[PDB]
Design a protein that fits this description.
The structure is a homopentamer. Chain A contains no helices and two strands. Chain A is mainly β. The first copy, chain A, has a single domain, classed as Amyloid A4 (Irregular). The radius of gyration of chain A is 13 Å and the shape is elongated. β2 of chain D pairs parallel with β2 of chain E, so a sheet runs across the interface. Chains A, B, C, D, E: This is P3(42). The PDB classes it as protein fibril. Keywords: alzheimer's, fibril, protofilament, beta-sandwich, quenched hydrogen/deuterium exchange, pairwise mutagenesis, protein fibril.
Chain lengths: ~25, ~25, ~25, ~25, ~25
């Protein structure tokens, strides 16, 4: 499993909700 | 299980929400 | 396994929520 | 088996919340 | 099973909340 979450935001501001879900159950 | 995400945005602002569903149930 | 998460924000500001959920239950 | 969570915040300011949960149950 | 979590902040801090939770159970 190779997760790759790249966010390139040039001048975010306002309301920006960054949610990273990384749960594992084995 | 490759999950490549390359979001490229210039001047986001406003109302934005990022969600990365990375749940593994084994 | 691998879980990359990069957030490139050029001049964030405002309201920014970062939720990194990294739980490994084995 | 790696967990990368980097946030390149250039000139944040304002309201910026950060919540990273690093759980490793084995 | 490494964790590379970091938040680069170049200028501008204002109200910021850096909440990290490390739970290494082996």
């Amino acid at each position: 499993l190779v997760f790759f979450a790249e966010d390139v935001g040039s001048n975010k501001g306002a309301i920006i909700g960054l949610m990273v879900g990384g749960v594992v159950i084995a």
